[PDB]
Structures are given as structure tokens and as C-alpha cells.
Paper text:
Computational design of KE07 involved construction of a theozyme to catalyze the chemical reaction, which was then grafted into the scaffold of imidazole glycerol phosphate synthase (HisF) from Thermotoga maritima. Catalytically essential residues from the initial design include a base (Glu101) that facilitates C−H bond cleavage, an H-bond donor (Lys222) to stabilize the phenoxide intermediate, and a π-stacking residue (Trp50), which was designed to stabilize the transition state and favor substrate binding through interactions with the aromatic ring of the substrate. This initial KE07 design (Round 1; R1) catalyzes the cleavage of 5-nitrobenzisoxazole, with 103-fold rate acceleration over the noncatalyzed reaction and a turnover rate (kcat) of 0.018 s−1.
In contrast to the improvement in turnover rate across the first four rounds of mutagenesis, which was unambiguously the result of reduced activation energy due to changes to the local electrostatics of the active site via mutations within and near the active site, the catalytic efficiency of R5 and R6 is improved by more favorable collision frequency (the activation energy actually increases). Thus, the mechanism by which the remote mutations that appear in R5 and R6 increase activity is qualitatively different. This is mirrored in their location within the protein; in contrast to the initial mutations that affect the active site directly, the mutations in R5 (Val12Met) and R6 (Lys146Thr) are remote from the active site. We also solved a higher resolution structure (1.61 Å) of R6, in which the active site of both monomers in the asymmetric unit were observed to be fully in configuration B, with the imidazole ring (an analog of the benzisoxale substrate) of the histidine tag of a neighboring KE07 molecule in the crystal lattice bound to the active site. The anomalous KIEs observed in R5−R6 correlate with the increased sampling of the alternative active site configurations.
Residue numbers in the entry: 2 to 263
The structure:
């Protein structure tokens, strides 16, 4: 019944892709300052999703993880093309609370178990990109481009069996949309796993988060809707609490310039 609000930042070469509209920041495209800003206004957890193309990706992600852990105190996940145990191991040891895998786990589900055996299930996030194909939810890999022919219902069960800690459920059918989370897909997955389910893609307004939690999501992740300020994070948490959703609010408070405190 406790619910989580997460912000995700897509990063390339240590930069926020397409930036943000927070001109109060010294550099609105710097993922550490943006991430620290989110942790101060009330985001519960962060995801840093790297799309660095060329041969610099591994070093780039280790450098990001290093800088994030030194400045940021809320949990964060790194993801985006993490392909084996040694890469994931390096990133956790460098300071990431959680590592997210997708394509590599679909192709080699043993990878889930290998990470969880050393670092515990709570360190493992599996991102599942799913799409309706001929009346069935399917799993897509390679940045949503490869139909694996694997059914979502089968993969969710296998992901829990292999030892993942939580699932991010990203609806390709909502990619870039603003009409709501894929609540039908969330409801479809909810009876199939006891793991935390994190909704991703489709958020356009505050009411969409309420819908996702009524559908059984344990957490809701968004990116552009926060970065370009269509939704204010504190306003969202106040709205959710007002309508009965158990979000984390008492741990915040100081954002209205209330007198002074030395």
C-alpha cells in the first residue's frame, strides 16, 4: 500500500538528453544537479538510463555512478545496455544501489540470478518493455525494436523465479504518449508476480499516477513529464495523499521558505 514516485533521466556522455526546463539550476542538462534537485523536492528514487553509443559507454557509466553516489542520498538505479555480471558488479561496487537489466537478461536469464546471488535480489531490477502483438502482450528487446516472441506473462514469472527484486513495466504502446499509464497491462501483470511493479510510459497528468496505483502498481516512474515541468513532483504527492494514496510526505517539508533555521 506504500507507493513510490521515481524520476528517470536518460543520459548520453554524462548529459541529460533533451535537458530540462529548470532554469533555477546552474546547468539544467547536468544529471547530478537535476538528480539532486529531484531528491530535494520529493522524488523517492532515481533511475539513470545511459544511451552512450560508442566505445566509451562502460567508463562513462562508471563515472556517472561515482558522481551520483557522492552527491545523492536517495536510492538510485543505473540501466541501459548492462550486458553481463562483471559490468553490473562494477557499477554496484562503484555506488549504485540497484542495476537494471533488460535485453541481456531476456537473452541470458541466468544473469539475474548471478547478480542476485552476490548482491541480493534487492539490487536487481528488470525492465520489461512490452507491446500488444496480435492480442497478446509480448516482450521486446534492443530498445523496443526486437519482438522476442516471448509472452509477457511467461517472462514475468521467470524474472521472479530467477531472483529479480523489482520489475519496471514499460508499455511500448504508451511510448511518448500522455494519455495515461497502461493500466490494462499493469492489471494483467499484477496477479502473476509478488514483486514490486513499477509503471513506466504514458504519464501526462497527476490523475494518471492515481490510476496506475489503483491498477496495482507499487511505484510510478516518469521522465519528460517532470523534466519539462508538466507535473510538479510535490504537487503530485500532495494530490495523491489527498485522495488516499500512501506516499512519502513527512520526510519533506522545507520548500516554502518557512522563516529561518540555522
Amino acid at each position: 500500500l506504500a507507493k513510490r514516485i521515481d524520476a528517470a533521466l536518460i543520459v548520453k556522455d554524462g548529459r541529460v538528453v533533451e535537458g530540462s526546463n529548470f532554469e533555477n539550476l546552474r546547468d539544467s542538462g547536468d544529471p547530478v544537479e537535476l538528480g539532486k534537485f529531484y531528491s530535494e523536492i520529493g522524488i523517492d528514487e532515481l533511475s539513470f538510463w545511459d544511451i552512450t553509443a560508442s566505445v566509451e559507454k562502460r567508463k562513462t557509466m562508471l563515472e556517472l555512478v561515482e558522481k551520483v553516489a557522492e552527491q545523492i542520498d536517495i536510492p538510485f538505479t543505473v540501466g541501459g545496455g548492462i550486458h553481463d555480471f562483471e559490468t553490473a558488479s562494477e557499477l554496484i561496487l562503484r555506488g549504485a544501489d540497484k542495476v537494471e537489466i533488460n535485453t541481456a537478461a531476456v537473452e541470458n536469464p541466468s544473469l539475474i540470478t548471478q547478480i542476485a546471488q552476490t548482491f541480493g535480489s534487492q539490487a536487481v531490477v528488470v525492465y520489461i518493455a512490452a507491446k500488444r502483438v496480435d492480442g497478446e502482450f509480448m516482450v521486446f528487446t534492443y530498445s523496443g525494436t526486437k519482438n522476442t516472441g516471448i509472452l509477457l506473462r511467461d517472462w514475468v514469472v521467470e524474472v521472479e523465479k530467477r531472483g529479480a527484486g523489482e520489475i519496471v513495466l514499460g508499455s511500448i504502446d504508451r511510448l511518448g504518449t500522455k494519455s495515461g499509464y497502461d493500466t490494462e497491462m499493469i492489471r494483467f501483470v499484477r496477479p502473476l508476480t509478488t514483486l514490486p511493479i513499477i509503471a513506466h510510459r504514458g504519464a501526462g497528468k497527476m490523475e494518471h499516477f492515481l490510476e496506475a496505483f489503483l491498477a496495482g502498481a507499487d511505484a510510478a516512474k516518469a521522465d519528460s513529464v517532470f523534466h519539462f515541468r508538466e507535473i510538479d513532483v510535490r504537487e503530485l504527492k500532495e494530490y495523491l495523499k489527498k485522495h488516499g494514496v500512501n506516499v512519502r510526505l513527512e520526510g519533506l517539508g522545507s520548500l516554502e521558505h518557512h522563516h529561518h533555521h540555522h
